[PDB]
Structure 1
């Protein structure tokens, strides 16, 4: 009897219906932070309703978030390859018209890649709202960094979601885009420094020469960020330069 929510038109669905559907499949007691409900048509046909939670689950990187349906028949809620692990925190449903039942599958790869791109569109929408992004970032910033570590195609887009303190963004974290806007036309590289903690990199003497040139320096105080940066290599055409390499 019930026409599944994900087969309905996103434009017609109310926030309340999305909230009820999220609570139903997750036991969360909070409404979801954001919902990304879309349809893909053409040589690839599938629909999905994906939810980003307001908080990281207790066992995020430790201790069946997506139900996979094929032609509206539930198949499994534990198909990996549907979404990479750094996105394990996303919940919802994916309904494929074409996936072949019973099983390197090509359809699965296309679906997976399409889902990652759509979730990155969602993260960019979220970033446009500081109240929402604050919740998003504090809960999943590490997951974003791990995506940057491994996703060669999407790491540039993901890099746009990273936030860091800097010699010019001391009370708030800054984005890489805003660092770039503050750059004088003669500055060619984005500079950063690494250290064991904020208090120590904040007074490193290597900063003196950059400050004398009025060049902003980003503060990276964790190996996961350092690796994210060397995997990125550049941002919006500007090379990422670690000022303590000499």
Structure 2
């Protein structure tokens, strides 16, 4: 039997992926999205990663991804192969090189390993973008992993910006539909040089904040950030597409 992840993703059917996913996830639903890719050149390896439709049970074992080296399974609990904020992904990674028998750290800090981690992260972001093109599929994604996308902004200095494109919020100009930062900017008149936002413990709380009246007076949109980890993401991002992020309750 020839390992599925090695066939060309255009010669594989959805009926097939679904199947493979179920055998490694015990899930009852079909994966939300499949990203099957191959990398060649100085670095060679293949991967088939899955994005579930729901979040797992626990609020917040990591033995998801199966690490194969030249088609030889090694461990289902590979440490440092995928960043923790991406722990929800399922699948298998097969690497051509990468030495064998690594004494703790040489397995969790290996140069080859570090390179593969960044490609997967880059790849999933590409994947996340594709999903965002499918409104219906996206809402399902964001209602399940918006938090993860936020944790991703917290720590990945290299990808921080890309992921920020996946964030969605309720603004003073968008009460019945979360809006993205991209749309926000588009709605920005030329003299407005700052993306405004306010944080609060709940939506109800911030809608009636006495700070909004002056922004509304300049007809400046204001983002509502109501999750505890939202503010740190914004201070970690600093700016978005060249525009500064500014809490309307500070300097």
TM-score by length of 2: 0.95
How far did residue 62 of structure 1 move?
8.9
| Deviation beyond 3 Å, 4+ runs, structure 1 | none
Cα deviation code 1:32-91 (max 9, x no counterpart): 000000000000000000000000010251991000000001011001100000000000
The whole-number CA distance in structure 1 between the counterparts of 2:52 and 2:42 is: 31
| Native 8 Å contact 1:60 1:88 kept in 2 | no
| Native 8 Å contact 2:62 2:87 kept in 1 | no
- Structure 1 residues 79 and 13: CA distance shift in structure 2, 3 A: same
| Native 8 Å contact 2:201 2:228 kept in 1 | no
Deviation larger for 59-68 or 83-92 = 59-68
Please state if 1:122 is matched with 2:127. yes
Unmatched tracts of structure 1, length 5 or more: none
The whole-number CA distance in structure 1 between the counterparts of 2:56 and 2:119 is: 24
The whole-number CA distance in structure 2 between the counterparts of 1:13 and 1:126 is: 19
Aligned match of 1:43: 42
The whole-number CA distance in structure 2 between the counterparts of 1:22 and 1:71 is: 21
Q: CA RMSD in A?
A: 1.1
The whole-number CA distance in structure 2 between the counterparts of 1:172 and 1:99 is: 46
The whole-number CA distance in structure 2 between the counterparts of 1:62 and 1:47 is: 23
How far did residue 223 of structure 1 move?
2.5
How far did residue 130 of structure 1 move?
1.1
The whole-number CA distance in structure 2 between the counterparts of 1:49 and 1:64 is: 15
How far did residue 196 of structure 1 move?
1.8
The whole-number CA distance in structure 2 between the counterparts of 1:150 and 1:62 is: 21
TM-score by length of 1: 0.97
Unmatched tracts of structure 2, length 5 or more: 102-108
- Structure 1 residues 63 and 86: CA distance shift in structure 2, 3 A: closer
| Native 8 Å contact 1:50 1:91 kept in 2 | yes
- Structure 1 residues 78 and 62: CA distance shift in structure 2, 3 A: closer
Deviation larger for 217-226 or 163-172 = 217-226
